[PDB]
Paper text:
To better understand how 91AEVVFT96 self-associates to form fibrils, we determined the structure of the fibril-like crystals of 91AEVVFT96. We found that it forms a Class-7 steric zipper (Ref. 25 and Fig. 2D) in which the β-strands stack into antiparallel β-sheets with identical side chains on both faces. In addition, to further prove that β-strands F and H can participate in amyloid core formation of TTR fibrils, we determined the crystal structure of the steric zippers formed by the segments in isolation by x-ray crystallography. The crystal structure of 91AEVVFT96 revealed a Class-7 steric zipper with antiparallel β-strands and antiparallel sheets (Ref.
Transthyretin (TTR)3 is a 55-kDa protein that aggregates into amyloid fibrils under pathological conditions. In its native tetrameric conformation, TTR transports retinol-binding protein and thyroxine (T4) in the blood and cerebrospinal fluid. Amyloid aggregation of TTR occurs by dissociation of tetrameric TTR into monomers; these partially unfold into amyloidogenic intermediates and self-associate into soluble oligomers and amyloid aggregates. Here we identify two segments of TTR that drive protein aggregation by self-association and formation of steric zipper spines of amyloid fibrils.
Residue numbers in the entry:
A (entry chain A), B (entry chain A), C (entry chain B), D (entry chain A), E (entry chain B), F (entry chain A), ...: 1 to 6
Write the structure that this text describes.
């Protein structure tokens, strides 16, 4: 699982 | 920007 | 921004 | 910026 | 910013 | 598990 | 899994 | 799975 908030 | 890989 | 998962 | 790898 | 996981 | 807040 | 950003 | 954006 990968979460990237930018 | 939101990326969610599950 | 928000993510919730299960 | 938030990165969460699980 | 916040993450909670289990 | 990797959390990176920047 | 990998993320790169700028 | 992959995403690239600019």
């Amino acid at each position: 699982a990968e979460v990237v908030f930018t």
